[PDB]
Amino acid sequence: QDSASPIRNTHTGQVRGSLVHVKDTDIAVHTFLGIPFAKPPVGPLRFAPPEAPEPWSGVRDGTSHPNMCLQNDNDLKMMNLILPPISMSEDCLYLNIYVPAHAHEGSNLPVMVWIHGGALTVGMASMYDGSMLAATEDVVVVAIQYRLGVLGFFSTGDQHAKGNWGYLDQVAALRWVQQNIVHFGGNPDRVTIFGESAGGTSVSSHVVSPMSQGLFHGAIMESGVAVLPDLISSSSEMVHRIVANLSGCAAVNSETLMCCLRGKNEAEMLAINKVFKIIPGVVDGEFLPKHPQELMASKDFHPVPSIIGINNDEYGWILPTIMDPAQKIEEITRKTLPAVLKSTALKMMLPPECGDLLMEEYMGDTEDPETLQAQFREMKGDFMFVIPALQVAHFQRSHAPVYFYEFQHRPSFFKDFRPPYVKADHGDEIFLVFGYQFGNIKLPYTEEEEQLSRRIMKYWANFARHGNPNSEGLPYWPVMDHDEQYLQLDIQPSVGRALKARRLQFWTKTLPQKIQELKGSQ
Amino acid sequence: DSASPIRNTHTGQVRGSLVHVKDTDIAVHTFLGIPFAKPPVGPLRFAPPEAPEPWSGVRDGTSHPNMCLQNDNLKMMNLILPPISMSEDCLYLNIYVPAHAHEGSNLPVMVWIHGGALTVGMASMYDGSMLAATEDVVVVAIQYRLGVLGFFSTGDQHAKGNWGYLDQVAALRWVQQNIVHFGGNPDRVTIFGESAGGTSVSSHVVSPMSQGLFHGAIMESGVAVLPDLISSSSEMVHRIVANLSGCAAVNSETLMCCLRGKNEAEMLAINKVFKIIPGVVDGEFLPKHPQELMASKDFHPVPSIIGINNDEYGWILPTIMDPAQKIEEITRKTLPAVLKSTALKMMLPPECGDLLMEEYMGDTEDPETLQAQFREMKGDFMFVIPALQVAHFQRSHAPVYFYEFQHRPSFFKDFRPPYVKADHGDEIFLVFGYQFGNIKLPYTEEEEQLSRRIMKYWANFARHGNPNSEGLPYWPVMDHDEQYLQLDIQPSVGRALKARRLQFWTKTLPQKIQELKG
Numbered sequence A: 001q002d003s004a005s006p007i008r009n010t011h012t013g014q015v016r017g018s019l020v021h022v023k024d025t026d027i028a029v030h031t032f033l034g035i036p037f038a039k040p041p042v043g044p045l046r047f048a049p050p051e052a053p054e055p056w057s058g059v060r061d062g063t064s065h066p067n068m069c070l071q072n073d074n075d076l077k078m079m080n081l082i083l084p085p086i087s088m089s090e091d092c093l094y095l096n097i098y099v100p101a102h103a104h105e106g107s108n109l110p111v112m113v114w115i116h117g118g119a120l121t122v123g124m125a126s127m128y129d130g131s132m133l134a135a136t137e138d139v140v141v142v143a144i145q146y147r148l149g150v151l152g153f154f155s156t157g158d159q160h161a162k163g164n165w166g167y168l169d170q171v172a173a174l175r176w177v178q179q180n181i182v183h184f185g186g187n188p189d190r191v192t193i194f195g196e197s198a199g200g201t202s203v204s205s206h207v208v209s210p211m212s213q214g215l216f217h218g219a220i221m222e223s224g225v226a227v228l229p230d231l232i233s234s235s236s237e238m239v240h241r242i243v244a245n246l247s248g249c250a251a252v253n254s255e256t257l258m259c260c261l262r263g264k265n266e267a268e269m270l271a272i273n274k275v276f277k278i279i280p281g282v283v284d285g286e287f288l289p290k291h292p293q294e295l296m297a298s299k300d301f302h303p304v305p306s307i308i309g310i311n312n313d314e315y316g317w318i319l320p321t322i323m324d325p326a327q328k329i330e331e332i333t334r335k336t337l338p339a340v341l342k343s344t345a346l347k348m349m350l351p352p353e354c355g356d357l358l359m360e361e362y363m364g365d366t367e368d369p370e371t372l373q374a375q376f377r378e379m380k381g382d383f384m385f386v387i388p389a390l391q392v393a394h395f396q397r398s399h400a401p402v403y404f405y406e407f408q409h410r411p412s413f414f415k416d417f418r419p420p421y422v423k424a425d426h427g428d429e430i431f432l433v434f435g436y437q438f439g440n441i442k443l444p445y446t447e448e449e450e451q452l453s454r455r456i457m458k459y460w461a462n463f464a465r466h467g468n469p470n471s472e473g474l475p476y477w478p479v480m481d482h483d484e485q486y487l488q489l490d491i492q493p494s495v496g497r498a499l500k501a502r503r504l505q506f507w508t509k510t511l512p513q514k515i516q517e518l519k520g521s522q
Numbered sequence B: 001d002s003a004s005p006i007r008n009t010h011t012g013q014v015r016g017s018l019v020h021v022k023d024t025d026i027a028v029h030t031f032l033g034i035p036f037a038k039p040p041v042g043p044l045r046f047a048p049p050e051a052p053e054p055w056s057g058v059r060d061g062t063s064h065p066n067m068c069l070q071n072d073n074l075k076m077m078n079l080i081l082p083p084i085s086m087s088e089d090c091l092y093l094n095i096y097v098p099a100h101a102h103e104g105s106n107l108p109v110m111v112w113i114h115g116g117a118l119t120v121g122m123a124s125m126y127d128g129s130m131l132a133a134t135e136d137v138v139v140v141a142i143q144y145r146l147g148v149l150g151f152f153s154t155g156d157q158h159a160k161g162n163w164g165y166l167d168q169v170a171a172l173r174w175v176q177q178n179i180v181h182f183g184g185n186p187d188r189v190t191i192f193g194e195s196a197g198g199t200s201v202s203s204h205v206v207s208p209m210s211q212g213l214f215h216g217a218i219m220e221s222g223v224a225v226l227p228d229l230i231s232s233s234s235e236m237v238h239r240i241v242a243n244l245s246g247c248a249a250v251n252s253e254t255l256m257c258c259l260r261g262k263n264e265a266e267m268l269a270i271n272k273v274f275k276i277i278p279g280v281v282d283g284e285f286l287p288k289h290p291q292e293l294m295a296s297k298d299f300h301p302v303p304s305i306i307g308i309n310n311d312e313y314g315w316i317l318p319t320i321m322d323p324a325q326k327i328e329e330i331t332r333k334t335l336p337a338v339l340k341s342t343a344l345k346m347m348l349p350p351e352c353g354d355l356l357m358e359e360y361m362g363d364t365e366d367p368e369t370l371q372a373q374f375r376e377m378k379g380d381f382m383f384v385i386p387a388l389q390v391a392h393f394q395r396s397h398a399p400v401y402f403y404e405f406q407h408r409p410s411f412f413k414d415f416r417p418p419y420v421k422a423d424h425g426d427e428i429f430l431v432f433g434y435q436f437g438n439i440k441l442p443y444t445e446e447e448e449q450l451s452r453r454i455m456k457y458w459a460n461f462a463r464h465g466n467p468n469s470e471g472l473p474y475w476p477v478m479d480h481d482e483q484y485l486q487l488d489i490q491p492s493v494g495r496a497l498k499a500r501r502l503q504f505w506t507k508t509l510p511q512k513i514q515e516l517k518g
């Protein structure tokens, strides 16, 4: 049967993979783990663009998971059970490849490149196992890594540190895929980039980037786009000043600062890094030559065909758990709501006068605390995820096919160990995209969930093959046009039109107009 | 007006010098002999290029670099060269920048790739000062491994090949990393080159290894399918070098150790056998044959200028490849046998001789006319038909601007036979504003105006991916109407250049070859 130790060519040398079986298939998978796509970004290559990797002499071991990039532990008890024993290092520019075991140089399979999320400060490729997706849909799955936190996103806003190191690493990984994936049996002309949350923001940033042109044929943006408010910044000023200050560096010049910051060891860099729970991309002038808003609004914007979507409860549970650890949302009453919404307006970078606009839009005359709290979670999910997705879909759909989804399936394994109000939380679709297969865990699923995961994997792989999710036997997914149709993605399939049109009117026209009226009372 | 400018690179500081260009106000900073790769010597012979080493202090950028190892077989050519030596240590580039420019000036960048059949040439023949000064542009002249050292391949892991092409990639990666320090815009890099430099540029256009390293391409009298400069098989270069070296190894691992042991004189002796050497389909720089890469529905070329001259086989190439002047012996009596010999060189069966004769000579009796028809046919096969085929493949995916250059240079007109129109290379004089290594060529007022037009077309293309600007004659983009610029003192536009010849070479002759079979 299939080879236990497959050897494959790369530009830098041969790599030895291993053979893996997935549940309930004769189809086996070849894995190639920890392949370097760039030189380790250490010493003078810290806060520098990625350089081309060194050649090696022998057959390189491709059976070991790579180091994750430097990051902090900011429950997560379960993440360390369902993770390999991964170590952490500045030496982390590696990718992992999952290929059907039949495939070899020239098999010409579609390629799906997974970009992990984690607020551009946490995560790793080795959390994700592409074996089930690879095996079921006859597809090459590539999981990449990129610099995170200060090492990924530090910027002086000048030539000494333009920034977006992590995004340049993602470019370097996609260039590697163009140059090498044919040797693994992938088709470099059918590469689809996909990612969730900050991975969606990453994918969406590639879609607008002149630097990423020709590195992929299609894009999938799950619960994250390039204008996700906390992951993009016009100014480098605060990351510049905070890192310069905390590092203790003498900082008369950016040139002196860069020498001092390159002198810091890993423990010193981890201490500076821990301050940033989230970190934004900047307008670096290279990867993002302008703000993603300006790039999408451009008459000369030429996006690839795209899938864009969101879940029906983006702010249901996991994000409130992380960003409201004291459970203040459960204290919301009609009495407290005005003050909570003034505090929310400031976090959304609105004037505090907008608190009452948010209240009228999302809560109206509602007195019931349970209802008020659900309206509050709706409003947050809309601001952070749903409105940005709808805006980006609107900008892309005049130039290229957009297929829009709202994912609605509450996962069976979580529904009893979460509050009963939680529908499809942030990240709930990832379980179905990967066929319930992750690092060292097969998640439990119902028959219905298996059928829905098969449907989602075939939509995604069909899109990777053809730039269209549709095929005979899958429910119809209409392309998004002036009717603004979207897939209601659940066990029972349906189609809607103009998702949250009144909310989109509120956020994009009503609220900016009312802010402009405040400047008139002043 | 700085006499000794200092500029930053990733590997350290360089000291340039100040140059003034004839009768004009813009001065130029030059930075010569900058390393873009580690010397490809010892274990780095027949190996991909490594990143250059950092240096302490300020490196001298006032001296021209060594040329790569090569053989000479034009006495007065070396009179117009600076006194440069030859070495395996030759991975250097030269930079010409307007003297006003500094780190962040964000000028367009033009990267010149020299020709010479992938066996001869050097950056130091070319002086970018006049182009840099006239058009406010950074001009970079690169070097790359030539001959056996550039293009030896075992067709396997031990020597995949295309070392010279990987050096050109390494020079473009250096430009991405460093040109901002010289005042160049790394997002407006245009690669340009003539003949094997055109073939090189055209190979970058199809290469996944070169994607994102340039914004535009200019292919002067050479593309990636130029018949003698591409090979599917490494077999002949593999066996000839293995045999001549005396290495005689049963395995390519032993062969590679033996070939790395040879000194420079031993390598020059092996090298001399190859007057021309091809790129291989290595699976990496060229993942498939350039024909297949261009024919692909997923071919994504940059905007391109592609062109040829009206007399590609007029004088210089016949002088080099017909030293015995047997073209001047052609008569109606000898023509059939000459064309059977020509068919074999074009890799056609000898039966095709009479097809070539009908197509290019017909009933013609006059020896002078027959000889002109023969030179036309060779220029068409080697240059014109390949350029039109590549322009056809590119133009449905990206803007192509096509030119036929027609200007006979005034300084050569009296010296050459009167039948010679715009010979192979004649446009290079106008692209560089008649400025070369330690020579300013003499030109008429009309030639100055035409050179200013060509430099502005090329620099406009570097800035915008479109040669056009107000005051230049219109250059239409190439679409289904197949318009091209007739580039001469009097501007004009044609459609479907040599359409009957294109029909002959691309449909009639292949059909008749398939009729010889079966």
Ligand SMILES: *[C@@H]1O[C@H](CO[C@@H]2O[C@@H](C)[C@@H](O)[C@@H](O)[C@@H]2O)[C@@H](O[C@@H]2O[C@H](CO)[C@@H](O[C@@H]3O[C@H](CO[C@H]4O[C@H](CO)[C@@H](O)[C@H](O)[C@@H]4O[C@@H]4O[C@H](CO)[C@@H](O)[C@H](O)[C@H]4NC(C)=O)[C@@H](O)[C@H](O[C@H]4O[C@H](CO)[C@@H](O)[C@H](O)[C@@H]4O[C@@H]4O[C@H](CO)[C@@H](O)[C@H](O)[C@H]4NC(C)=O)[C@@H]3O)[C@H](O)[C@H]2NC(C)=O)[C@H](O)[C@H]1NC(C)=O
Residues within 6 Å of the ligand: A244, A245, A246, A247, A248, A249, A250
């Ligand atoms: C990281 O950031 C923090 C915070 O920075 C601040 O906030 C951010 C957001 C930005 O807005 C910054 O612009 C802003 O500065 C930095 O911490 C701050 O550091 C500054 C110095 O830049 C301090 O200002 C001085 O404070 C001293 C008094 O404070 C000292 O004593 C404290 C104990 O009570 C101790 O905890 C402090 O650490 C501090 O100790 C000193 O530290 C500095 C820096 O290393 C060192 O140079 C001193 O030698 C040392 N001093 C002593 C006695 O131990 C105050 O006395 C100073 O006043 C003089 O200096 C001013 C500017 O130079 C000037 O305007 C004043 O008028 C005054 O000037 C003197 O005048 C007389 C004549 O009248 C003359 O004879 C003297 O020669 C002359 N001297 C000078 C030098 O001019 C001064 O105000 C801030 O208090 C401090 N803030 C906090 C909250 O801690 C930190 O530096 C950053 N780190 C890095 C690596 O960048």
Ligand SMILES: *[C@@H]1O[C@H](CO[C@@H]2O[C@@H](C)[C@@H](O)[C@@H](O)[C@@H]2O)[C@@H](O[C@@H]2O[C@H](CO)[C@@H](O[C@@H]3O[C@H](CO[C@H]4O[C@H](CO)[C@@H](O)[C@H](O)[C@@H]4O)[C@@H](O)[C@H](O[C@H]4O[C@H](CO)[C@@H](O)[C@H](O)[C@@H]4O)[C@@H]3O)[C@H](O)[C@H]2NC(C)=O)[C@H](O)[C@H]1NC(C)=O
Residues within 6 Å of the ligand: B242, B243, B244, B246, B247, B248
């Ligand atoms: C470089 O290439 C040279 C040509 O090689 C041939 O052509 C290439 C393209 C391939 O097809 C290759 O496979 C061919 O062999 C090559 O020169 C040649 O070398 C071979 C030996 O491999 C010679 O064959 C033998 O010749 C002798 C006669 O003596 C002469 O050769 C020796 C060599 O040491 C000299 O010292 C003498 O003075 C003579 O000049 C025959 O007696 C002998 O026959 C016996 O051996 C073979 C098997 O080994 C049996 O098949 C026979 O039955 C006999 O038992 C060989 O036939 C060949 O004649 C010679 N050609 C020429 C034109 O000189 C050269 O060696 C290559 N260089 C390196 C370093 O590899």
Ligand SMILES: [Cl-]
Residues within 6 Å of the ligand: A036, A038, A039, A040, A052, A053, A054
């Ligand atoms: Cl490396």
Ligand SMILES: [Cl-]
Residues within 6 Å of the ligand: A117, A118, A119, A120, A196, A197, A198, A199
């Ligand atoms: Cl995230």
Ligand SMILES: [Cl-]
Residues within 6 Å of the ligand: B035, B037, B038, B039, B051, B052, B053
């Ligand atoms: Cl070096």
Ligand SMILES: [Cl-]
Residues within 6 Å of the ligand: B115, B116, B117, B118, B194, B195, B196, B197
């Ligand atoms: Cl040439």
